[PDB]
Amino acid sequence: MNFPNSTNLPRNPSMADYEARIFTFGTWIYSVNKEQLARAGFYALGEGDKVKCFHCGGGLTDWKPSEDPWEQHAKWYPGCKYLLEQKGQEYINNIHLTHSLEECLVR
């Protein structure tokens, strides 16, 4: 099924280490930075710039220069327990507020 892992157990424990995740990108000259994706929980799927969070399983693609790994992780997979552990709710809410503001302003 599509649905995102909101348990405290990672969906892909084989990608639980940074170094495991880093290797998946290989050479990588997409708009957004591979080290920063890896720190944000992501590993490469091996097609385009598709990445998945090792924990929540959540997938993201089509990275723009202005799109931040942690920020996009929170936008789209807010139930992620890796996210919650690494950044912690005060960060997490401010970024939700930031997003939900933009969506309720120019849009």
Ligand X SMILES: C[C@@H]1CN(CC(=O)N2CC(C)(C)c3nc(CO)c(Cc4ccc(F)cc4)cc32)[C@@H](CN2CCOC[C@H]2C)C[NH2+]1
- Annotated binding residues: 53, 56, 73, 80
Q: Using CB under 5 A as the criterion, which residues of the chain lie in contact with Na ion when the complex forms?
A: 26, 46
- Which segments within 1-107 are labelled E, that is strand? 42-44, 51-53, 59-60
We find the least distance from the C-beta atom of residue 24 to Na ion, in angstroms, to be 7
We find the least distance from the C-beta atom of residue 4 to ligand X, in angstroms, to be 8
- Please give the Cα distance from 107 to 39 (Å, whole number): 31
Please say whether the beta carbons of 16 and 24 come within 8 A: no
Per partner kind, with CB cut-offs from 5 to 8 A, the member of Zn ion, Na ion, a second copy, none near residue 26 is Na ion
Query: Which residue's CB is nearer to a second copy, number 44 or number 56?
Result: 56
Q: Does 52 bind ligand X (CB under 6 A)?
A: yes
End-to-end CA distance of the chain: 31
